């Protein structure tokens with residue numbers, strides 16, 4: 001009975017940077033051609049959502065953020081062929097249009113239809129499906145999952161297993177897949193290798209999971225918050241180091257510990273300095289460093305290109321290098337077959353109405369992932 | 375006989391930066407254990423040798439430079455097993471000790487015994503075999519080929535085909551192998567791809583050769599000296615562009631030409647700005663950029679890490695990624711079997727006594743490789 005009609009529902013609207021979200025009524029338009037309207041079931045709080053609040057990641061405001069989620073299709077627009085009403089789905093913050101040069105490339109995943117490189121905060125057609133207080137509200141990464149209902153382009157949604165536990169598999173929509181893929185797909189961690197992981201939040205823990213799945217012999221976790229170390233060891237870290245404990249720069253410490261540099265390093269924080277440190281700590285001739293963290297808007301790092309000339313490889317990726325629509329359903333199926341665990345990432349559960357408390361938990365350092373239930 | 379005796383011979387000594395080489399008599403000590411004394415036959419002038427002169431590459435002075443060469447073994451020290459008097463050899467400016475973690479790694483070539491990272495200007499034992507006017511003279515990269523005779527460590531020499539033309543295959547000691555391997559081994563250029571090569575000197579031409587051998591469909595040469603374009607097209611460039619001809623930055627031009635960025639780019643100059651440009655012009659999701667040029671001493675570049683986060687790979691390499699002692703004899707065998715050409719790189723052939731004139735031809739833009747013959 002809601003098909004083709006505007007839905008009034010609650011969402012978490014961000015009117016201004018550095019302010020709490022406002023939980024209030026919004027109007028959600030019905031889906032246009034090749035659009036899908038989704039009743040959200042669960043959404044995670046990723047640090048990237050906090051970057052919108054802090055102005056680390058610039059996107060137009062006011063906005064409905066959220067990009068790590070799962071829900072159930074309420075209705076489909078004309079021409080949709082890949083999902084149906086009642087299907088469980090994960091919104092894809094990295095689309096997979098299937099048609100652009102990146103989607104056609106065997107190793108590309110950062111589809112040209114993304115809204116991350118130069119955010120406009122719209123649907124693919126350049127418009128918004130959201131109104132609040134009579135004012136248009138921006139989308140975020142084509143997903144806008146901090147709402148009881150959202151509308152996404154068909155290229156930004158994947159159908160998943162009907163028996164999936166949505167309160168767990170929402171993490172496949174960002175943090176798990178990103179970290180795990182950064183290890184297994186992007187870095188291609190090898191059996192017996194030594195890895196260093198900078199940042200032990202939900203994404204860095206997922207990197208550790210992937211490095212352990214790939215057979216690394218040593219996985220060194222690096223965080224300035226020693227409270228993060230116990231869970232990092234639970235999921236595979238062999239040792240953890242806090243840069244604040246040492247007189248020398250941590251790249252020197254890690255080089256010493258690894259008898260000349262690590263095989264694979266990962267920056268999973270979002271700081272320019274730790275991007276350079278993570279590069280430096282990998283072995284100069286054959287090391288690989290992967291940037292995963294989101295940098296502060298418009299800022300440049302400084303580095304000595306001799307770090308690369310000796311043989312290092314430096315790369316980054318979005319969403320763990322996974323082609324999103326192909327990969328998300330497979331990841332869910334693998335989760336259902338117990339090929340990896342998600343519970344270690346989930347430290348807190350809250351109702352959606354307590355979103356601000358969920359952000360407080362992230363900012364205090366206490367949580368990994370809080371899962372919000374609608 | 376000269377074996378076991380000091381040899382007095384002619385060499386080109388660099389007494390201070392930014393001055394001509396001094397062509398004069400030096401004394402060359404006999405080889406100690408695990409050392410090899412070589413009568414030089416031909417040596418190329420590589421831009422890296424000019425970097426010593428210009429202070430772009432810091433190494434202890436006074437020095438006998440030269441690292442791209444070929445000669446004939448005059449004598450061997452105790453314990454040498456890999457070459458014998460009379461053998462044709464190429465000195466290896468990147469050693470292959472066979473024992474270090476890099477040598478044992480399948481993809482590493484920048485052996486830890488190298489003298490490039492932290493140049494000492496000596497033999498492996500920390501001493502010099504050269505004196506001039508009563509003063510000790512430094513080695514360069516364990517090779518020092520601007521001399522009628524040199525002494526190298528065994529790990530810094532490879533035996534090559536006895537029928538090799540040394541006046542050509544000396545280029546396998548640096549510029550050919552570096553450029554060719556940077557394409558075929560480090561970048562792993564693919565069939566049908568689009569490449570951009572920044573800098574069309576001897577090394578950049580060799581990159582083009584490798585890109586063509588790997589089956590690239592398009593190879594765009596980039597140089598500010600349009601006189602370099604004809605030879606670049608002869609060896610495989612499909613297009614050449616001069617940044618000075620355009621109102622827009624050349625990364626934008628190249629991105630437009632390639633309908634969204636190139637598959638592979640190469641920086642083969644040694645400038646910070648062109649390293650960043652070359653990275654930027656590769657496709658943001660799956661492009662690869664390789665730094666080959668030697669940067670100016672102690673200078674850092676500035677870049678936006680979103681260039682990497684989207685999916686680019688940035689790497690550099692010494693000597694085309696080739697394990698030097700394994701690879702050099704095979705490259706020479708391949709040359710003998712007509713698998714690649716060296717003549718396109720050779721624009722001038724001068725007696726050794728004309729070393730300064732050879733450097734002037736490089737600096738003026740007029741040469742690719744000058745081969746000096748002893």
Ligand SMILES: NC(=O)c1ccc[n+]([C@@H]2O[C@H](COP(=O)([O-])OP(=O)([O-])OC[C@H]3O[C@@H](n4cnc5c(N)[nH+]cnc54)[C@H](O)[C@@H]3O)[C@@H](O)[C@H]2O)c1
Pocket residue numbers: 045046047048051174175178198199200201202203204222223224225228243268269270271274291292293294295317318319320368683
């Ligand atoms: N590339 C992608 O597709 C992608 C996906 C998801 C998240 N991200 C980014 O990845 C980063 C991590 O996200 P998350 O795991 O949700 O965040 P998080 O939970 O905030 O974890 C970051 C961790 O970094 C630690 N940290 C902060 N500063 C330092 C320091 N100087 N040295 C060492 N550790 C430090 C911090 O204590 C925390 O445990 C953020 O920048 C996200 O925006 C990127």
Ligand SMILES: NC(=O)c1ccc[n+]([C@@H]2O[C@H](COP(=O)([O-])OP(=O)([O-])OC[C@H]3O[C@@H](n4cnc5c(N)[nH+]cnc54)[C@H](O)[C@@H]3O)[C@@H](O)[C@H]2O)c1
Pocket residue numbers: 419420421422425548549552572573574575576577578596597598599602617642643644645648665666667668669691692693694742
């Ligand atoms: N990585 C290695 O193992 C390795 C080996 C050999 C050479 N090198 C370095 O590679 C670089 C090239 O050596 P080479 O081919 O002998 O030098 P080269 O013959 O001087 O060629 C350099 C080319 O760059 C061109 N150039 C200069 N400035 C610009 C600019 N702003 N934009 C575009 N083109 C420009 C110039 O006109 C010339 O044709 C040097 O920095 C060497 O030191 C590195």
Ligand SMILES: [Zn+2]
Pocket residue numbers: 095096097098099100101102103111112113
């Ligand atoms: Zn696409």
Ligand SMILES: [Zn+2]
Pocket residue numbers: 046047048049067068174175
């Ligand atoms: Zn995220």
Ligand SMILES: [Zn+2]
Pocket residue numbers: 469470471472473474475476477485486487
């Ligand atoms: Zn070695």
Ligand SMILES: [Zn+2]
Pocket residue numbers: 420421422423441442548549
């Ligand atoms: Zn050279």
